[PDB]
């Protein structure tokens, strides 16, 4: 209906709030909503890991690993 397109937008819903909550140094937010769509984007490789789209989600789960990481340093 399709699972996939909804939890893309779940997760793109979240990683736009993690980037919002980020710059505004707002840090524990931006933190829980990191993690929130960490969370989504894996449950995506866990129900269709052979998705075409899997490197770009294993890409977008790297690069909010590596910006709680920062901002764990800072808070």
Same mark, same amino acid.
């Given at each position: &209906?399709? @699972?996939?397109? &909804?939890? +893309?937008? &779940?997760? !793109?819903?979240? @990683?736009?709030?993690? $980037?919002? *909550?980020? %710059? +505004?140094?707002?840090?524990?937010?931006?933190?829980? #909503? #990191?993690? %929130?769509?960490?969370?989504?984007?894996?449950?995506?490789?866990?129900?269709?890991? /052979?998705?075409? *789209? !899997?490197? *770009? #989600? /294993?890409? &977008?789960?790297? /690069?909010?690993? %590596? !910006?709680?990481?920062?901002? /764990?340093? $800072?808070?």
């Amino acid at each position: &209906m399709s @699972a996939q397109v &909804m939890l +893309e937008d &779940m997760a !793109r819903k979240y @990683a736009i709030l993690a $980037v919002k *909550a980020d %710059k +505004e140094g707002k840090v524990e937010d931006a933190i829980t #909503y #990191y993690k %929130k769509a960490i969370e989504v984007l894996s449950q995506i490789i866990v129900l269709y890991p /052979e998705s075409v *789209a !899997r490197t *770009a #989600y /294993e890409q &977008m789960i790297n /690069e909010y690993k %590596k !910006r709680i990481s920062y901002l /764990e340093k $800072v808070l």
